[model samples]
Target: STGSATTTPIDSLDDAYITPVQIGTPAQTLNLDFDTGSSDLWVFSSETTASEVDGQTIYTPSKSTTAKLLSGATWSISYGDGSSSSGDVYTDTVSVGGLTVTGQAVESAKKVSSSFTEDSTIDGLLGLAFSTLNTVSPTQQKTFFDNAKASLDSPVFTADLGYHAPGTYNFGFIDTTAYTGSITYTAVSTKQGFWEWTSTGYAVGSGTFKSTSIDGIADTGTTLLYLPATVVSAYWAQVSGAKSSSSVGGYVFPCSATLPSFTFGVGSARIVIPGDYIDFGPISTGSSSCFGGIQSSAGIGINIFGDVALKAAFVVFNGATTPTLGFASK
Candidate 1:
């Protein structure tokens, strides 16, 4: 998930749109957001005629001095929240940080929600959730990445999440450390925007979902860790008579609680969910020892690997190259 809680928009200067970036290029020349929740890089376009585009920043094709447009191909997108943007299938010779990549794919949004129209500072969004969901799909609604893939390096696609503060939202890399050269890459099966994993078996505090068992696409946008009920229940059953602690959200158990380690492998990568991670805020239901992080649901799709998983590692979206995600330690 591309989260730019740490990025800030470039301000205090005026000239040509300097601080160049790959996707989600801002209009005012600065403001940015690494939207790992979605998969399309966007910029506000001058074509927008909706009142919603009032205060929000709109990137002008003429301002680029280096802009391109594919006539006959216009686009529009709607989010689950009803927030939407529309424009023509466009390309711009863009730059990010110092990595200069030309003909970058971007969406120009002129019409948006009251929320977007009010924010005159930002130009557009830099989506980084997953590539399969790219809005660039012809019949499927194409994403910026889908169009820019050929021009990128390696497998391509990356989001460099800043340090949970305020700053610039750039493409490619975030402020993350190098990997130990060891990682696990798993192949995806589910096709929805949500990268889901089918569970194999269940084990708490130990090796559980491995091989083709759990999902490798652990999302950063999600707030909680969700697993299949059977896997969760089976794991909880091993927690030495655990109980829910209403102290927080109810999922948290006692410090003395003993939980077996849960480990799984994505590709060659093997992950073990530490006991500390399994113990969470509080139970959402009632006061129970079963804990919170693990909820009870029978027929739910898309088992989410959330903050519980993010806390233990640093995830990278390498969409710029390879079209794959890379995870490492914080």
Candidate 2:
């Protein structure tokens, strides 16, 4: 069976995307960030401390008669940025965009880091990464997609993330109409539990395409694009008054500076991030300084083709044997 879901941006400028997911038998709905970077389907639940939950819609397992506890089970997950959560485990009906997975492992957070407690719009995260990365103890958990993929027509999903607009996540099938031109394909290394691959190289503005061959992963959960320091520095060099901000943790520039399009090579196809999209808007409300949408990945080691970069093209996360990534102009 095929399914599709609308991913709406939480912020005005599309910093993060959230989609509605139904949990429990009676269907308690929560807005979750569909994160391809992670693999556990977790939520802010009644188990979480009151102060840590804020205004997020919490899941109450007790309210759902179908919910069953995974005895003596617990999970603790940490992100690349050090954000973490620890929680109890429950098996319940988890559905998204009309696709339901019965007895799915759902992690209910008992404690969350400041990164989660501060983001009031997101109730939880639905990880779309490989099941091998799941954090459930004793018995590993499968993602909603993996659980549903078996019954699907094809083990594939397409991500059409838009810039400052609504996008879609389509499962089990690829909608050719969602993209334009011939699609380019590249192999992926799933050994790392991510949609990891190497780009042929990149170009800044109208410069000649470089054959840098950067290794990175396509992460929908992350907000900005991250590359090597050399690449990041090259891009900022075009902007006046741009510098790395120790306090901000990335390069910042005057909001008034005009940025050039950043393009990455995907086989024969080239995905380009428009010049304006490079300026990730003001650093803070009413501030003249702005944070960049692209940063150096030196600290993380692995490059990240985050939302800013993905939004520049239509992406296909192919699950077939010899898994590959397909790209086409959006």
Candidate 3:
């Protein structure tokens, strides 16, 4: 019964990628953001108060004959960036790409933070992190990947994120054609329900790579790459007219500045994120000021290899056994 499903992810306002997922008996389609940083399959729902809701499609569980309420179970999730969602639970069939998992725990949102309500395009989030992070009360829930693993030949998924372009997420299988060269896998610790890994060192542009080990999480939900303040300062140092602005909250440089590419060490593989992608576009209109995609992980304890760095390589999330992370150029 092991099979694979592939879907091209749509780029969302340069902030994230949205994938189409079907929920319930008749398969109500919702464009959800697949987030590796969190664990919970939650969607905008009819139960949500009208004032708290926006133009996003709501999941009406009662409309699906197969939907069953989880009786007193509820879930509340708060993002690192302060966005939050809370709601009741439902057991229903959920399909991603073409793969289906029956009785998947679907958290229907009754209330969402202003950030989520403002983003009208994304219907919800399909968390791909370890099930241990699921926020369901009374009984923790299982993620779609965890529930569908036994049916898959190998519990592996690949995330191919692109820079302002369409990408793809491959489930239960890895497509060799999607990447170039051998995949270099690095040992990762999942004790925290995150794809946490350590970088042996990193380098700015063509400079010598230093041996500054940094612990970080690979998060598809986040938009920018965050590293240690010291490392961030070094990257900004090379850019002309770049400085850390209090208002901007991070390093900002002239739009015409020639930025250097950055490299991170994952095992023996050196994944280099190009300079253009590091620019992160302009911070404001008509002004030459531009934001650096890489920033200091001040408040957050660990660094984050978000879409900015992830788009530079093809990532393989191997959930089997010790859960290693594979990286290769696309």
Candidate 4:
């Protein structure tokens, strides 16, 4: 249930996408992932029907007593890698931290395959990413945000995914001070997903990224950084001894290399992608080998900045305030 909420909504222009919600017995505090890329919240619940959810975590509703389902209000979604699931809608007393909002939308898609290799804590995704990407039916009265909007502090919040780290996410009022005013933005557009945004390319060391590199939608919800091959290989070449390893899907580099700092030109902003992120490896299967943070997704319509790049910058999803999404720090 962690997001870039890092769910629900974006916080400050740079805060992590975090939603302070209640979970566990006695409703303990937890931060959730709110992604607009896919609609539907998949929190683990005792009410779920399936038992095996692969390496991804599963959550049980922990309720012997709950509410009824909205007839014909069932749904499911599939991702790029051929995983899918389907489930019925359950309207019950869903709580986020202390704010218990009733009739929250939680989809239970057990029929699909798991997206990750680990599944103990996954439960499901809380699709609070965007109202536009919502799965709720047209006949439905409100979105989870829409329902809780009147009760919220403001009309919107931001979700800032740590550009270099993972786990730390925040919710509530947007804090303007968390970020240095170095901003570059592009209106969000959609292709095969991977929220499409325009960029001038990338720059490394003191050089500029060629015009051929495609700009990707920086999404924290994703776990992989997908890009074009030209960009990926070119990026790795800048690092000494870095080369493509046949075992990996993306460019491979040496583990101990101090990759140079890089910058991405997004519309009017030149976001600096740090060195730690330059050597994207640990998540890759090869030991002592690193993958280029950027990969080849050239043939593919959209570029994806999964968790690899997402964990670096703080993101905010402003459905509660303005649709003009903001990015900053936590």
RMSD of each predicted structure: 8.3, 1.1, 1.6, 5.5
lDDT of 2 by residue, 115-208 (tens): 9999999999999889999998877888988888887789888889988899999888989899888789998999999999999999999998
Identify the runs in model 1 with alpha carbons over 4 angstroms from their true place.
Answer: 1-32, 35-38, 47-56, 80-83, 114-123, 128-133, 136-153, 157-177, 190-212, 215-226, 229-300, 306-308, 316-326
User: What C-alpha lDDT, on a 0 to 100 scale, does residue 25 get in candidate 2?
Assistant: 72
lDDT of 3 by residue, 1-330 (tens): 343433333443367778888999798998888899999999999899789888899899999999999999999999999899999999999987778899999999999999989888789999989999999999999998899888876788888987767788888888889989989998889989999999888999999998878899989888889999999999999998999999988889999999999999888778899998887667876788988899999988779999888889999989997898999998
> How many residue pairs clash in model 4?
78
Provide backbone clash counts, one per model.
Answer: 59, 0, 0, 78
TM-scores vs. true structure, each candidate: 0.57, 0.97, 0.96, 0.75
Residue range 1-330, candidate 4, lDDT tens digits: 211133432322222244555533344343445554565665544444454444344444444145555667766566554655566666655565344567766554545454422334344555544445555463332445555667766655444455433343433455566566743344555343334555667776677665544666656565556777766666767888876655665566778788877666655556666777555455445577766665667655677766555555555545433344455423
lDDT of 1 by residue, 153-242 (tens): 433443222222222333333444434455444343435654444434444564445344655345544434666656666666676655
In candidate 4, how many Å is residue 229 off?
Answer: 2.9
Task: Give candidate 3 misplaced runs (Cα > 4 Å).
Answer: 1-13
Output the worst ten-in-a-row residue range by lDDT, candidate 2. Answer: 275-284
Q: How many collisions between residues are there in candidate 1? A: 59
- Badly placed stretches (over 4 Å) of model 2 are none
TM-score of 3: 0.96
Candidate 2 clashes between residue pairs 3 or more apart in a chain or in different chains: none
